[PDB]
């Protein structure tokens, strides 16, 4: 979608690994705030939005 | 922003009381540590205060 339309996808109810998603994507640019990305496989969200 | 200052973000383990470490070395990231570059890990140790 486009910037003043972005599309939003909530994801809930499953079990999320961080780590294959080093795999898709070059990575032109891939930063967090908040978080750190080799912590994220460990914490428990709520309900994570994309 | 004064460049003059700056932190360890990027440790092994964490450290015992009282002791400072200055050795820079750059982390490595699921594979042999880049030697020199950064990518979507591999990143420099030190960041600058400002």
Redesign the interface.
């Given at each position: 979608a486009s910037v003043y339309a972005w599309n939003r996808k909530r994801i809930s109810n499953c079990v999320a690994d961080y780590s294959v998603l080093?795999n898709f994507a070059p990575?032109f640019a891939?930063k967090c705030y908040g978080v750190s990305?080799?912590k994220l496989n460990d914490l428990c969200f709520t309900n994570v939005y994309a | 922003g004064n460049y003059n200052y700056r932190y360890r973000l990027f440790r092994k383990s964490n450290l015992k009381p009282f002791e400072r470490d200055i050795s820079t070395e750059i982390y490595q990231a699921g594979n042999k540590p880049c030697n020199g570059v950064a990518?979507?890990?591999c990143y420099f140790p030190l960041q600058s205060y400002g």
């Open positions: 080093y990575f891939f990305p080799t | 990518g979507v890990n």
